[PDB]
């Protein structure tokens, strides 16, 4: 199997300051993604592509795609008074064996990450080129 996964969130407002535990799996080649931690751990060295889609409601939402402690990409969305919204992101990253990639909200002031049984926020990633 090649490293590739897609995980969905089905409960709104996950913890701030910790990897978002997307736990509904569609695929998880090589099991490099852990639904119990929300972290993708690099086993195969190379270039990867990650994508994420997060809904917003009740409050602003600020997320960052992390590679270990480093924020690689930031996505911010301001809640639209009374309505559900969404913001997305994607990025190509060169990963070293052991690198841990995940999505996380850095601020308690922007924790409006929404999700539901029929409204999936998600996180996907897969190997492009082995290095």
Given the rule CB under 8 A, which residues bind its own copies?
Answer: 2, 4-6, 8, 26-27, 29, 47, 49, 51, 53, 55, 62, 72-80, 83-94, 116, 118-120, 122, 124, 126, 128-129
Residue partners of 67: CB distance under 8 A and separation at least 6: 93, 95, 99, 100, 101
Stretch that binds ligand CPS, among 1-9, 15-23, 50-58, 103-111 (CB under 6 A): 103-111
Among 31, 68, 88, 109, binds ligand CPS (CB under 6 A): 109
Residue partners of 114: CB distance under 8 A and separation at least 6: 12, 13, 54, 55, 56, 57, 58, 61, 84, 121
111 binds ligand CPS (CB under 6 A): no
What Cα–Cα distance (Å) separates residue 87 from each residue in 1, 37, 61, 69, 125?
31, 22, 9, 22, 17
Q: How far is the CB of 80 from its own copies (least distance, A)?
A: 6
110 binds ligand CPS (CB under 6 A): yes
Give one DSSP letter per residue of 53-70, joined into a string.
EEEEEEEEEEEEEEETTE
41 binds ligand CPS (CB under 6 A): no
Q: Which is nearer to its own copies, 43 or 76 (CB)?
A: 76
Give me the count of residues in the chain.
131
Q: List contacts with ligand CPS (CB under 6 A).
A: 60, 62, 76, 107, 109-110, 117-118
């Amino acid at each position: 199997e090649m490293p590739a996964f897609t995980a969905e969130l089905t409960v709104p407002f996950p913890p701030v300051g910790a990897p978002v535990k997307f736990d509904k799996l569609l695929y998880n080649g090589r099991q490099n993604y852990n639904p119990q931690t929300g972290i993708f751990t690099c086993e195969v060295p190379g270039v990867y592509y990650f994508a994420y889609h997060v809904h917003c409601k009740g409050g602003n939402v600020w997320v960052a795609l992390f590679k270990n402690n480093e924020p690689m990409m930031y996505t911010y969305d301001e809640y639209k008074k009374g309505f559900l919204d969404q913001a997305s992101g994607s990025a190509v990253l060169l990963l070293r064996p052991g690198d841990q990639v995940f999505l996380q909200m850095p601020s308690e002031q922007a924790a409006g990450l929404y999700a539901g049984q029929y409204v999936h926020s998600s996180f996907s990633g897969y190997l492009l080129y082995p290095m």
